Design a protein around this motif. Structure first.
Motif, PDB file in Angstrom:
ATOM      1  N   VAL F 104     -57.095 114.924  48.520  1.00 23.99           N
ATOM      2  CA  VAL F 104     -57.785 116.414  48.199  1.00 23.99           C
ATOM      3  C   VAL F 104     -59.231 116.033  48.256  1.00 23.99           C
ATOM      4  N   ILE F 105     -60.053 116.915  48.677  1.00 20.83           N
ATOM      5  CA  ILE F 105     -61.494 116.735  49.053  1.00 20.83           C
ATOM      6  C   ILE F 105     -62.092 118.250  48.126  1.00 20.83           C
ATOM      7  N   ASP F 106     -63.138 117.780  47.265  1.00 26.86           N
ATOM      8  CA  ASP F 106     -63.792 118.865  46.761  1.00 26.86           C
ATOM      9  C   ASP F 106     -64.998 118.990  47.516  1.00 26.86           C
ATOM     10  N   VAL F 107     -65.056 120.111  48.158  1.00 21.89           N
ATOM     11  CA  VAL F 107     -66.357 120.338  48.621  1.00 21.89           C
ATOM     12  C   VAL F 107     -67.523 121.328  47.956  1.00 21.89           C
ATOM     13  N   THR F 108     -68.434 120.847  47.665  1.00 15.74           N
ATOM     14  CA  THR F 108     -69.383 121.403  46.748  1.00 15.74           C
ATOM     15  C   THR F 108     -70.709 121.930  47.659  1.00 15.74           C
ATOM     16  N   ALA F 109     -70.974 123.316  47.959  1.00 18.93           N
ATOM     17  CA  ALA F 109     -72.168 123.772  48.762  1.00 18.93           C
ATOM     18  C   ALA F 109     -73.148 124.276  47.942  1.00 18.93           C
ATOM     19  N   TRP F 114     -74.627 119.551  51.138  1.00 15.81           N
ATOM     20  CA  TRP F 114     -73.304 119.561  50.998  1.00 15.81           C
ATOM     21  C   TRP F 114     -73.177 118.384  49.642  1.00 15.81           C
ATOM     22  N   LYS F 115     -72.396 118.561  48.991  1.00 14.51           N
ATOM     23  CA  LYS F 115     -71.429 117.501  48.127  1.00 14.51           C
ATOM     24  C   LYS F 115     -70.144 117.404  48.377  1.00 14.51           C
ATOM     25  N   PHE F 116     -69.577 116.258  48.401  1.00 12.24           N
ATOM     26  CA  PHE F 116     -68.055 115.871  48.642  1.00 12.24           C
ATOM     27  C   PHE F 116     -67.628 115.071  47.672  1.00 12.24           C
ATOM     28  N   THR F 166     -70.072 112.286  47.258  1.00 12.63           N
ATOM     29  CA  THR F 166     -71.139 111.850  48.306  1.00 12.63           C
ATOM     30  C   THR F 166     -72.203 112.895  48.199  1.00 12.63           C
ATOM     31  N   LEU F 167     -73.239 112.921  47.826  1.00 13.22           N
ATOM     32  CA  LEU F 167     -74.499 113.830  47.557  1.00 13.22           C
ATOM     33  C   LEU F 167     -75.414 113.834  48.904  1.00 13.22           C
ATOM     34  N   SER F 171     -83.177 113.706  53.348  1.00 10.95           N
ATOM     35  CA  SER F 171     -83.579 112.604  54.367  1.00 10.95           C
ATOM     36  C   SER F 171     -82.330 111.817  54.565  1.00 10.95           C
ATOM     37  N   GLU F 172     -81.121 112.215  54.351  1.00 10.74           N
ATOM     38  CA  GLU F 172     -79.933 111.522  54.344  1.00 10.74           C
ATOM     39  C   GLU F 172     -78.778 112.510  54.677  1.00 10.74           C
ATOM     40  N   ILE F 173     -78.194 112.572  55.807  1.00 10.93           N
ATOM     41  CA  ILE F 173     -77.072 113.570  56.254  1.00 10.93           C
ATOM     42  C   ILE F 173     -76.040 112.875  55.355  1.00 10.93           C
ATOM     43  N   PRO F 174     -75.083 113.771  54.506  1.00 12.16           N
ATOM     44  CA  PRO F 174     -74.033 113.470  53.782  1.00 12.16           C
ATOM     45  C   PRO F 174     -72.777 112.922  54.726  1.00 12.16           C
TER      46      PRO F 174
END
Ligand SMILES: CCCCCCCCCCCCCCCCCC(=O)OC[C@H](COP(=O)([O-])OCC(O)COP(=O)([O-])OC[C@@H](COC(=O)CCCCCCCCCCCCCCCCC)OC(=O)CCCCCCCCCCCCCCCCC)OC(=O)CCCCCCCCCCCCCCCCC
Ligand SMILES: CCCCCCCCCCCCCCCCCC(=O)OC[C@H](COP(=O)([O-])OCC(O)COP(=O)([O-])OC[C@@H](COC(=O)CCCCCCCCCCCCCCCCC)OC(=O)CCCCCCCCCCCCCCCCC)OC(=O)CCCCCCCCCCCCCCCCC
Ligand code: HEA
Ligand code: HEA
Ligand SMILES: CCCCCCCCCCCCCCCC(=O)O[C@H](COC(=O)CCCCCCC[C@@H](C)CCCCCCCCC)COP(=O)(O)O[C@H]1[C@H](O)[C@H](O)[C@@H](O)[C@@H](O)[C@@H]1O
Ligand SMILES: CCCCCCCCCCCCCCCCCC(=O)OC[C@H](COP(=O)(O)OCCN)OC(=O)CCCCCCCCCCCCCCCCC
Ligand SMILES: CCCCCCCCCCCCCCCC(=O)OC[C@H](C)OC(=O)CCCCCCCC[C@@H](C)CCCCCCCC
Ligand SMILES: CCCCCCCCCCCCCC(=O)O[C@H](COC(=O)CCCCCCCCCCC)COP(=O)(O)O
Ligand SMILES: CCCCCCCCCCCCC
Ligand SMILES: CCCCCCCCCCCCC
Ligand SMILES: CCCCCCCCCCCCC
Ligand SMILES: CCCCCCCCCCCCC
Ligand SMILES: CCCCCCCCCCCCC
Ligand SMILES: [Ca+2]
Ligand SMILES: [Cu+2]
Ligand SMILES: [Cu+2]
Ligand SMILES: [Cu+2]
Ligand SMILES: [Mg+2]
Lengths: 551, 55, 139, 184, 66, 299, 143
Positions: F104-109, F114-116, F166-167, F171-174
């Protein structure tokens, strides 16, 4: 039998022949003419917005445009080119020929007809006036989704001017639709029954009903949106459920609105095919039923734009959207049947109408693909959509618009546009549009979303974007021949001394002089079918048409 | 003279207001002269229509 | 005008059927129950055609066959005065300017400009209504 | 005979106006479904001791407006003025009655930004109140035209179409009054 | 590259405009050819008169021959 | 050829994607066949029915063929009915949700990245169990009367948070790490505006909405499995603001053992960049790179 | 007797049609040259307050008498000046109404003929008429 005539018609009126007429006219012919000039001014203005976008999406990276400027560009481009160009020109052609088609001396409300033009013109200018603001114009897209259009996410005055500019323009559209319904019902000439009017008049009456269903709900939604930004209301609050509330109302407006700018141009080509084919319109009774079915079906299919939201009943809207494909397909078979076993000469009004059939079909095929939610789950909010709606909106508001202009220019001028210059314009437009919008089908499928200011070089979208950029500039340079043709042929065009420069006209406007008098008619022929002008000009064909009507 | 208040109330850049008035100081009088000249002559034609055709 | 009213009744039946079916199809199948924003529009869409259709029905049953409603009607049958049509008026452009002034005030939230626009609209609308009814000056 | 062009135009436009209220009804119903059990929530407390007498006045205004229509068709301009002046006064009482109810609701904590119910309630009723105010302006404008020229059939037609708008406004309020003060 | 991209955008529309214009603008229009003195007057008689001023005894005239 | 009839559609990495692509090719074939017939009819009459320069009499004036009109009305109805059935069949499979998912993945936009988060991991074979629910930080947003059902618009209780997250950074693609051949559940929750969770290789997307429960939106979708490993790019598809085009993400698919190991370093306090390097994977995204901060080349 | 596609309306007006792609006027002269001639005719008559007419066609056996009947078709024959040119007969005839007499036309009538003739040797028909109208209109006083 010598009659005295001028060597050439007067190029232009004397000083002061127009300026006081422009602001005091109640004549639908002059009002319709002012529509086309303003509509094309907005067409050129909105077209320049796309050129800046197209030239920015040519090479990866922001060369001369920022993200905010690009976001403002497509919002204003779409708003101008759907609501400030496409919607008004529906009534632009309607103020031109509809009173002539039904044998009427004027519109039902001459004062209210003039009010619609000025209300629209000042409403359109208000929305565009957001550019001069330091923050900029609207940058949230013409669908203005919530809560992006919120004061918290859209605090600038450009968005506020966009909302109020649409409300003023929407009021003019409602009044114009009210005028058209009353004119058709009450101002019909004797002998002109309901099932005897031209198809274009049928489409405008049907379209005007769609205006009354869609535009008031848009005005209500925008007023509620203005309350949130100014009064701090919770109409479209996400916790309150306004994210779905706004989209539902906006798309209940939107999909009836695209058929507001589709059916009249279906009527325009429906008046051009019989004239240049020397044949009656095929399935005249069937076309009316198809138009009514399209109008009725367009109201309960609003949520197929909302497939990716995952909050609508997919089986209901997918099935209802598929139902629209049947009456639209019937129209092609009637139009093809009109040209079948005819005598086609392919003049400029006919040439543009033929390009409509080729262009519209590809966009129509893409519509059925998007109608299925499983296929829409991947191509929604991508350039596959943009390719689909620039094939369906360019097949009508442009090809059919140009066909109607070339068709009705001698009627309202007494002068003929140049055919050699017209053929150049049509081919340039066709080649440019196809070049700039055929490759976008692959771009959206490859994984490129719509409303993107910048893309990375590793995305692999550079080659197709350059090809699309080349074609778009061909569309830009295709405007010069048409503008030159209108500018020159208005004053130095070939004079028209006959009622019907196209010979085989069917509707009643071809039974009057070019240009028609102030009251549009110095005489009226007997009306016994849908082609009174053809019967009048060719009395010997009255017997043949009745006997050969049924196959 | 009221550009700064117009800029604040109507959300316009102050540099824009100064340059709009600067360019408009010569462009707008020319435009108004042409419109007024045609409007005045246009009114005369409107009167000629009533004389030769009635109300 | 039998055909004119029949057009709106045909639309009325389809709109009524769609509103009833879609309401009953979302109450038991859509997530969250009835789609309200969405259903309310469909129900009142029927009312738009119902009001116009009912009025056209009542009008049709009062007046007999019009010259434009006659299959084989002669041009001379419709001879006579049609009515009053305004020849010219500069009031409509003033009404649009008055309405646009209020809209700009509403967009920028200027209470003074909104009040001026409302007063301008009433003044401009009054001129349009009274344009063809003002009597001669009494001196 | 002849179809009344002005009446046809007014009726056609009146049907379009109904779609404007369709958007307002959608906002109220959408917020109602998300209430969760409290509709209206605290501290909003609607009272029928004031809404009912004001609603009855607006309903009674339709009867007086229709009486003026009969006088207008009869050619009695003075009878038309008498009934429309009474209708204007009772129509004005509706605005004052609604405005008085607004003051008490605001003082009790029910405001447009205060609650989501306040937003749907005020915009739905307030936009209708604007329509009543617009109808009152139409009454004054039409009455002013009656003293400008003789009572012509065109003048009588303008009286009839104005009553059509008033009847539409009264009918809309009945739907709003039943939806808000009874369907809670 | 960047030079090829700019050349195609600014070059192809101009090249296509020139090629397409030569195809159509060099064609003969519907306007009839200019009458020549050597050719006989096969056209119908033409009577031209000005509309001014805004609205039979002959006072005389003059003759000529070329 | 499936590579040309797909019109650029990716092959797909999930069984639902493979089924969706099969429907796309058949629908395109049906659409092209209809388009060719209509184009052929238009071209046939445009080249053989042109005004002959010796035909005096006008052509037959026929405009009604009742047997033909009915035939060309039923046939389009049959084609859409056939397509509608396959449309219903495919969408039911794509929207099917297994009651017992394994990841189960929590996807926060948010605006604009994006935050995973890993809500729960429970492998079907019982070789890896994990519970990422963190109830000590979800209820810190309670805010209460309230304008909407007793709560302010800043309630934010609908948002989900996890111990391992994962935030994304400008400068860093999630990077989202998922096991191969395992069922994945995606829970989409926005923060301010609507975003779009689109993976082109998934051949499916769903709009990320704020307060999805209050909007009657089904913000949960599942994939049966991922059939191959690698890196796949993901873009924001719904317009959300200034940086709508500069909030892309990447989905990384690894072996189940590698995925189980990767969670261990993340639980051990390691960041996403170093944890990926610990399982012999690139620390940064390879399909996409962070966009330059320079508003342009004229800055 | 009416041409193909032409019909007689109820009010006596003729509703004519032309085949698509064809012209309704098709004067065998360039459009720009026709505009210049119209400007000479419209402005020349304006500065002279006498209607100016140009006729091209046959003039029968006697050119002088034919132009007299042709001038009757010109609106307001009494205050009209007609210039008749016959390319086949190579003759120029000028005739004016009674009101034109005594206004200075007698000194401009040979002036227009000579000016038109001089340009007629060069193969220019429209140019000759334009030159004739200019000189003939410049030697006529208002009213
Ligand atoms: C915007 C804000 C406005 C600011 C102030 C406005 C100043 C008005 C100036 C004025 O008096 O104009 C008339 C004025 C003449 O006034 P007049 O003395 O009463 O008339 C003398 C003529 O002989 C009269 O001869 P005529 O009556 O025979 O003229 C025939 C024909 C003349 O047609 C032509 O030959 C013109 C060439 C056409 C352009 C081709 C464009 C292609 C569009 C295709 C459309 C297909 C149909 O004109 C028309 O019928 C055009 C009617 C449509 C005009 C719409 C105007 C609406 C704007 C209302 C604001 C006021 O025109 C000029 O000579 C001005 C020339 C400069 C014009 C360029 C201005 C650019 C603005 C863009 C316009 C786009 C609209 C948005
Ligand atoms: C809103 C749009 C309302 C107008 C829709 C008209 C549909 C009926 C078609 C028609 O007959 O046209 C009549 C006529 C059309 O001109 P025409 O070509 O000479 O027609 C010849 C007729 O045969 C000659 O017939 P007539 O001279 O006997 O006049 C007939 C007229 C009789 O006119 C009257 O006596 C009273 C009408 C005055 C308009 C009310 C003032 C609006 C200001 C609201 C202020 C409160 C905020 O009856 C009507 O038009 C029905 C109107 C009923 C009143 C509805 C007011 C809705 C406002 C709701 C507020 C929101 O136009 C009018 O007389 C009134 C039209 C009003 C135009 C202004 C629209 C902008 C208002 C902005 C409001 C936002 C405020 C911020
Ligand atoms: C009638 C509708 C209509 C028309 C005619 C057009 C015309 C064009 N459009 Fe547009 N467009 C839309 C309706 C239309 N558009 C809508 C609804 C959207 C979505 C909005 C949104 O995303 O929110 C959209 C968005 C949109 C997109 C995708 C938006 C995105 O990136 O997300 C693109 C792709 O580049 C595009 C390009 C074009 C091009 C190249 C033309 C060509 O037709 C234009 C070329 C025409 C010209 C006229 C060139 C100008 C010529 C000149 C000479 C200019 C000079 C002018 C002056 C000097 C005043 N438009
Ligand atoms: C003139 C304008 C116009 C017209 C006519 C149409 C016509 C259709 N449109 Fe579209 N559409 C738009 C303008 C238009 N559209 C715009 C502007 C948008 C997006 C705007 C935005 O979001 O910003 C849009 C977006 C849009 C969407 C939303 C997609 C998305 O956002 O993801 C969908 C979904 O179904 C859709 C489908 C259709 C269908 C099925 C038709 C059908 O009516 C077309 C049917 C026509 C035919 C079918 C051809 C004739 C039939 C035959 C020749 C027989 C063939 C038979 C079979 C194939 C069975 N279009
Ligand atoms: C009284 C009306 C008379 C008008 C008559 C006609 C005359 C108008 C002439 C037009 C003049 C416009 C030129 C202004 C040129 C200029 O200097 O302004 C620029 C900003 O662009 C603009 O102005 C574009 C807007 C143009 C306005 C168009 C005019 C229409 C209006 C006037 C109509 C009025 C409506 C009717 C009223 C009704 C009443 C009755 C009629 C940049 O300045 P700045 O703002 O510092 O932005 C910085 C960057 O520069 C820098 O790079 C960097 O990016 C940053 O530093 C940035 O901040
Ligand atoms: C035009 C709109 C007028 C402005 C209406 C307004 O903003 O009033 C809102 C106001 C709420 O203000 P608030 O912060 O709650 O403090 C009040 C303390 N007594 O107080 C109110 O809630 C009064 C609202 C009255 C109803 C106005 C309806 C307007 C409808 C058109 C918008
Ligand atoms: C004649 C003036 C016409 C407008 C002059 C400017 C009209 C200028 C149009 C050509 C130049 C446009 C080429 C693209 C320029 C660009 O890429 O942006 C750079 C700039 C830095 O950013 C801008 O935003 C530019 C201004 C945008 C246009 C405001 C439109 C105003 C709408 C109405 C308010 C007009 C009222 C007319 C009123 C006319 C006067 C009435 C008296
Ligand atoms: C404001 C009126 C208050 C009285 C309430 C009862 C209504 C009856 C009004 C009768 C007015 C008679 C005037 C008349 O006939 O004079 C006419 C001229 O006056 C007008 O035009 C007045 C227009 C008023 C516009 C403002 C309306 C504001 C409405 C606000 C609603 C809240 C006739 O003039 P004349 O006889 O030609 O000299
Ligand atoms: C007039 C039709 C123009 C169509 C242009 C299509 C170009 C496709 C090029 C594809 C190149 C892929 C590398
Ligand atoms: C309705 C389907 C239209 C499909 C258009 C495809 C255009 C060809 C693009 C080729 C790109 C090659 C890389
Ligand atoms: C379970 C709720 C059933 C609701 C039936 C539909 C109600 C529609 C209300 C529309 C009112 C418009 C004024
Ligand atoms: C579950 C309650 C549903 C209530 C639906 C509201 C319908 C109100 C219609 C009132 C119409 C009065 C004319
Ligand atoms: C491997 C690349 C294949 C590209 C195929 C392009 C097909 C284009 C079809 C166009 C159909 C237009 C109706
Ligand atoms: Ca770029
Ligand atoms: Cu659609
Ligand atoms: Cu986003
Ligand atoms: Cu985004
Ligand atoms: Mg979307």
């Amino acid at each position: 039998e010598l009659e005295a005539r001028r060597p050439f018609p007067e190029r232009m009126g004397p000083k002061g022949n127009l300026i006081y007429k422009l602001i005091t006219t109640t004549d639908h012919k002059l009002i319709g003419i002012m529509y086309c000039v303003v509509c094309f001014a907005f067409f050129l203005v909105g077209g320049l917005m796309a050129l800046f976008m197209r030239t920015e999406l040519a090479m990866p990276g922001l060369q001369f445009l920022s993200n905010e400027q690009f976001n403002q560009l497509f919002t204003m481009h779409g708003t101008v080119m759907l609501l400030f160009y496409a919607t008004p020109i529906v009534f632009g052609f309607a103020n031109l020929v509809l009173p002539l088609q039904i044998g009427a001396p004027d519109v039902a409300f001459p004062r209210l007809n003039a009010l619609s033009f000025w209300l629209f013109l000042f409403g359109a200018l208000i929305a565009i006036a957001g550019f001069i603001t330091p923050g900029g114009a609207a940058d949230f897209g013409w669908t203005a989704y919530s809560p992006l259009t919120d004061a918290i996410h859209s605090p600038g005055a450009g968005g506020d001017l966009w909302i109020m500019g649409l409300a003023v323009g929407g009021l003019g559209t409602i009044l114009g639709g009210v005028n058209m319904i009353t004119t058709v019902v009450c101002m019909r000439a004797p002998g002109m029954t309901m099932f005897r009017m031209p198809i274009f008049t049928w489409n405008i009456l049907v379209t005007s009903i769609l205006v009354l269903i869609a535009f008031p709900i848009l005005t209500a939604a925008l007023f509620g949106l203005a309350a949130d930004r100014h009064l701090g209301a919770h109409i479209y609050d996400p916790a309150n459920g306004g994210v779905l509330l706004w989209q539902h109302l906006f798309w209940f407006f939107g999909h009836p609105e695209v058929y507001i700018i589709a059916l009249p141009f279906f009527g325009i080509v429906s008046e051009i095919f019989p004239v240049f084919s020397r044949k009656p319109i095929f399935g005249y009774t069937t076309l009316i039923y198809a138009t009514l079915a399209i109008a009725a079906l367009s109201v309960a299919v609003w949520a197929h734009h909302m497939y990716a939201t995952g909050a609508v009943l997919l089986p209901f809207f997918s099935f209802m959207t598929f139902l629209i494909a049947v009456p639209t397909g019937i129209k092609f078979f009637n139009w093809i049947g009109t040209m079948w076993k005819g005598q086609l000469t392919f003049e400029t009004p006919m040439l543009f109408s033929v390009g409509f059939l080729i262009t519209f079909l590809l966009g129509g095929l893409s519509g059925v693909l998007l109608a299925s939610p499983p296929l829409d789950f991947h191509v929604t909010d991508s350039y596959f959509v943009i390719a689909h709606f620039h094939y369906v909106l360019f097949g009508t508001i442009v090809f059919a618009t140009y066909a109607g202009i070339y068709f009705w220019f001698p009627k309202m001028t007494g002068r003929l546009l140049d055919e050699r210059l017209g053929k150049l314009h049509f081919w340039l437009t066709f080649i440019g549009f196809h070049t700039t919008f055929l490759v976008q089908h692959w771009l959206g499928d490859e994984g490129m979303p719509r409303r993107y200011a910048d893309y990375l070089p590793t995305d692999g979208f550079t080659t197709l974007n350059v090809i699309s950029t080349v074609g778009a500039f061909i569309l830009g340079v295709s405007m010069l021949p048409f503008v030159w043709n209108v500018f020159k042929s208005w004053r130095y065009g070939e004079p028209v001394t006959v009622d019907d420069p196209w010979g085989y006209g069917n509707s009643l406007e071809w039974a009057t002089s070019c240009p028609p008098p102030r009251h549009n008619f110095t005489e009226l022929p007997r009306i016994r079918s849908e082609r009174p002008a053809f019967e009048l000009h060719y009395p010997h064909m009255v017997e043949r048409m009745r006997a050969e009507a049924h196959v | 003279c009221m550009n700064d208040i117009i800029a604040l109330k109507f959300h316009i850049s102050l540099n824009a207001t100064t340059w709009i008035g600067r360019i408009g100081m010569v462009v707008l009088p020319a435009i108004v002269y042409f419109v007024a000249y045609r409007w005045a002559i246009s009114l005369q034609r409107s009167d000629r229509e009533v004389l030769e055709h009635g109300v | 005008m039998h055909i004119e009213a029949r057009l709106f009744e045909i639309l009325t039946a389809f709109f009524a059927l769609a509103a009833v079916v879609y309401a009953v199809l979302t109450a038991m199948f859509a997530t969250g129950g009835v789609e309200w924003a969405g259903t309310t529009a469909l129900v009142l869409t029927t009312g738009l055609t119902l009001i116009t259709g009912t009025f056209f029905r009542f009008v049709a049953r009062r007046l007999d066959t019009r010259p434009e409603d006659y299959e084989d009607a002669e041009i001379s049958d419709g001879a006579g005065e049609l009515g009053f049509f305004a020849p010219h008026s500069w009031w409509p452009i003033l009404i649009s300017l008055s309405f646009s002034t209020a809209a700009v005030g509403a967009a920028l939230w200027l209470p003074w400009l909104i009040a001026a626009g409302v007063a301008f609209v009433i003044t401009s609308v009054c001129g349009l209504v009274f344009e063809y009814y003002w009597g001669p000056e009494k001196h | 005979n002849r179809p009344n062009m002005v009446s046809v135009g007014t009726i056609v436009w009146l049907s379009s106006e109904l779609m404007f209220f369709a958007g307002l009804f959608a906002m109220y119903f959408t917020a109602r479904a998300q209430a969760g059990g409290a509709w209206p929530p605290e501290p909003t407390e609607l009272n029928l001791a004031l809404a009912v007498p004001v609603t009855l006045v607006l309903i009674a205004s339709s009867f007086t407006c229709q009486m003026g229509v009969f006088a207008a068709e009869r050619g009695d301009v003075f009878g038309l003025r008498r009934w429309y002046v009474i209708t204007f006064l009772m129509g004005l009482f509706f605005v004052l009655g609604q405005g008085y109810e607004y003051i008490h609701l605001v003082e009790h904590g029910t405001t447009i930004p205060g609650s989501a119910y306040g937003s749907v309630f005020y915009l739905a009723t307030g936009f209708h109140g604007l329509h009543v105010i617009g109808g009152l302006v139409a009454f004054v404008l039409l009455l002013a035209r009656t003293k400008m020229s003789k009572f012509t059939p065109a003048q009588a037609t303008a009286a009839i179409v104005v009553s059509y708008y008033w009847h539409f406004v009264d009918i809309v309020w009945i739907a709003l009054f039943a939806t808000i003060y009874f369907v809670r | 590259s960047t030079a090829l991209t700019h050349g195609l955008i600014g070059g192809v529309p101009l090249v296509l405009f020139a090629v397409l214009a030569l195809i159509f603008l060099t064609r003969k229009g519907p306007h009839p050819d200019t009458y020549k003195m050597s050719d006989p007057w096969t056209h119908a008689p033409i009577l031209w008169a000005a509309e001014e001023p805004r609205e039979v005894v002959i006072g005389g005239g003059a003759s000529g021959k070329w | 050829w499936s590579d040309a009839l797909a019109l650029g559609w990716p092959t797909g990495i999930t069984p639902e994607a493979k089924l969706n692509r099969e429907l796309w090719i058949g629908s395109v074939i049906a659409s092209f066949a209809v388009g060719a017939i209509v184009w052929g009819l238009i071209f046939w009459t445009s080249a053989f029915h042109r005004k002959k320069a010796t035909d005096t009499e006008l052509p037959r004036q026929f405009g009604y063929n009742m047997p033909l009109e009915l035939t060309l009305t039923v046939i389009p109805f049959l084609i859409i009915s056939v397509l509608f059935y396959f449309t219903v069949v495919v969408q039911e499979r794509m929207m099917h949700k297994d009651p017992n998912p394994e990841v189960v993945i929590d996807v926060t936009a948010f605006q604009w990245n994006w935050k995973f988060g890993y809500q729960k991991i429970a492998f079907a074979d019982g070789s890896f169990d994990y519970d990422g629910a963190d109830p000590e930080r979800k209820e810190a947003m309670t805010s209460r009367v309230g304008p909407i059902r007793g709560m302010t618009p800043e309630d934010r209780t609908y948002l989900n948070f996890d111990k391992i997250e994962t935030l994304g950074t400008s400068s860093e693609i999630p990077v989202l790490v998922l096991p191969a051949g395992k069922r994945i559940e995606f829970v989409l929750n926005s923060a301010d505006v609507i975003h779009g969770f689109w993976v082109p290789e998934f051949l499916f997307k769903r709009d990320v909405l704020p307060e999805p429960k209050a909007n009657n939106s089904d913000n949960v979708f599942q994939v049966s499995e991922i059939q191959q490993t690698g890196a796949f790019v993901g873009r924001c598809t719904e317009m959300c603001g200034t940086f709508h085009a500069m909030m892309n993400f990447e989905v990384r698919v690894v072996e189940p053992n590698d995925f189980k190991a990767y969670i261990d370093q993340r639980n051990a306090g390691k960041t996403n960049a170093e944890a990926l390097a610990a399982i012999n994977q690139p620390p940064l995204a390879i399909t996409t790179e962070p966009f330059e901060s320079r508003r342009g080349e004229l800055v | 007797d009416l041409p193909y596609g032409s019909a007689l309306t109820s009010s006596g007006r003729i509703s004519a049609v032309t085949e698509p792609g064809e012209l309704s006027v098709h004067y065998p002269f360039p459009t720009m040259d026709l505009v210049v001639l119209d400007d000479a005719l419209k402005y020349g008559s304006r500065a002279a307050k006498a209607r100016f007419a140009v006729y091209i066609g046959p003039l029968g056996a006697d050119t002088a008498a034919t132009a007299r009947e042709i001038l009757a078709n010109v609106p307001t024959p009494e205050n009209a000046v007609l210039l008749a040119v016959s390319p086949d007969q190579r003759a120029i005839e000028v005739v004016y109404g009674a009101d034109v007499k005594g206004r200075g036309i007698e000194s401009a009538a040979p002036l227009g003929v000579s000016a038109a003739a001089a340009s007629f040797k060069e193969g220019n028909l429209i140019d000759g008429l334009i030159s004739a109208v200019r000189v003939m209109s410049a030697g006529v006083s208002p009213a």
